[model samples]
Target: NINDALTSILASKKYRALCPDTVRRILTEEWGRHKSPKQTVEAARTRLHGICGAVTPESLKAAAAALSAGDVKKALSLHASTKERLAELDTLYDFIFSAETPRRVLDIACGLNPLALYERGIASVWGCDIHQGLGDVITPFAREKDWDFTFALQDVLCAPPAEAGDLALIFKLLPLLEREQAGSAMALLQSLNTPRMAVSFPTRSEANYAAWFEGGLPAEFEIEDKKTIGTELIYLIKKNG
Candidate 1:
């Protein structure tokens, strides 16, 4: 724990949940860009917000505990925005899994989303996270369900985790990644070797994502399906030989 190094940022609590490895990288990057500790702290705060600071880490961990405790209703409430999509949840999910039924799913920037897959009976889930306390939650839960789940602490832009499955789930990630480092989203999108990929965006972002896609999304992958369910604009893509 680099608690002393990142004490200022961790004081806020939400940023505290990110894995120490990623926080160390953020500290090193920001420390050089800015002159003082205060400057560096604020810079790192923005960086955390850009990455995985949507919902607080507390709720995610609490939700994990709820899942373990066998409280189905309680577990789903971890992320506040989930209730908003209750009406379209089935439609949205059906558009994803009903057709492909991928045996192994690779979820990038995966927060609490894999819980849905675990309950829905997906064969295997490999996800990414910069999380606080998931080992206790995921390890015991995987054993209980007789399921296979694997995750790693990684900054996907700097080093993409190995594509360990047939489908890559890049949910609501492209726009934010582009904001962090210009052209990074496109580069990561291009570099991935997965045969199938799904990319999504929230309902109300004003960013120019189409131009972003036109600028650098590679030729090997073709947009097979594009649909909007609830507020999510999702694209199903496949890599063609």
Candidate 2:
């Protein structure tokens, strides 16, 4: 099965274009089933990481992995900005989650938690989303950072939070799916009565920003205010009295 999957991977142009080190990585994962600990892993890690030297076989893997890793890191940083935004939101709108505060924050529709997990300190963060692919990568990555949090393959829109969350975060996950799903996701989340929530959607231009809240969640949630930072439009919503 590993061979089959790797074969399938190889057939794709995307896979073929990957550096030889990437190929070796796939090979390592495949060979791992039959090989001993030090036999294949050390070789693969050395290759993928390039701890060896440049102009070598391992360096190629490092370059390829670096390219893919860059995209992943970018997405993660976008998500992590919430933690940074928390400070700004607190100053302006009295939103929750801060450097000094310890709260169980939820990244609703969090794809992989690339953002928060890499941050220096964030044990109280929890991420749930519909995409299991992202979760697969995120869980281990979190462990690598020595940071642990609850991550689950879940649909925050269709399903509901099993327990109350201090804050609900929706970032960059909207507008990628059907309109109904987005609306249902937000409406369901708003109904939860979470004391505070922060939502961010991309808007490269002012026109796009103007229409960012066209979904009408603010009125339904009794959102007090919102702000724009760079290309992101963030909404600070509060439960109705």
Candidate 3:
């Protein structure tokens, strides 16, 4: 029954397109909680359902199609998280790069983010996500656009990357990480060796950054600046050198 549980989750239309590693991880955790196979599958689905609808194969395909047609605005709107900040993107990017332009950007759990940022002057982008369906769409699209972007299939909870970059984008992901696994939000923050991180939370989140950073974020790090853009509250954080 345990052996069959994974396949049961992956075979569903909703979960099939997700990364196998992520699917397995979700199932394993639920199963460890002593859930029945049927209950385990449902729990995994519920967990994922919280994060879905923002990005889908259909949305990514639509984004690519629009991009191919040379419609940048429509393309951006069609992409997952990009659509949420479309109105204020220019300001957001301007503020991010305004202090000092980074040569390389490492975006953890990045989903269709680089697609909307194609016009920016950044030299290279390293974006990773656990959603297989997302990378499939962005990989070929980036290739066709001749963008210097790399999308890795990664489940961030399994292992935080040891690599460093000029900047790291942790957009709208910290709360979700905390929800998935206790203390993961802080664990991820402490693991990043990068100098600067643009961490964000949905403005709708009740506790927001104050609760997240209160005693949880280390003293070595400080929020240099903060901005509210559309539905997100972004923090520009600097690590002590």
Tell me the whole-model lDDT of each prediction, alpha carbons only: 0.72, 0.50, 0.78
Off by over 4 Å in 3: 1-3
- Steric clash pairs (candidate 3): none
Q: Say which candidate scores most in TM-score.
A: 3
For the record, the alpha-carbon RMSD of candidate 1 to the native fold, in angstroms, is 3.2
Per-residue error (Å), model 1, residue 191: 3.2
Better of 2 and 3 by lDDT: 3
How well does candidate 2 score on lDDT at residue 182? 39
Please give the lDDT score for candidate 3: 0.78
Which residue runs does candidate 1 get wrong by more than 4 Å?
Answer: 1-16, 46-51, 81-84, 134-136
What is candidate 2's TM-score against the reference? 0.52
Better of 1 and 2 by lDDT: 1
Query: Which is the better candidate, 1 or 2, if ranked by TM-score?
Result: 1
**lDDT (10s digit) by residue, model 3, range 1-241:** 6558767777888777776777777778888888666677788788777554447667767877877777777877875577888888888888888898888888888876776557786778888787776677667767887888888877788878666788999988887888878889878978886899988887775264666565588788988888777788888899886
Task: Put the candidates in TM-score order, highest first.
Answer: 3, 1, 2
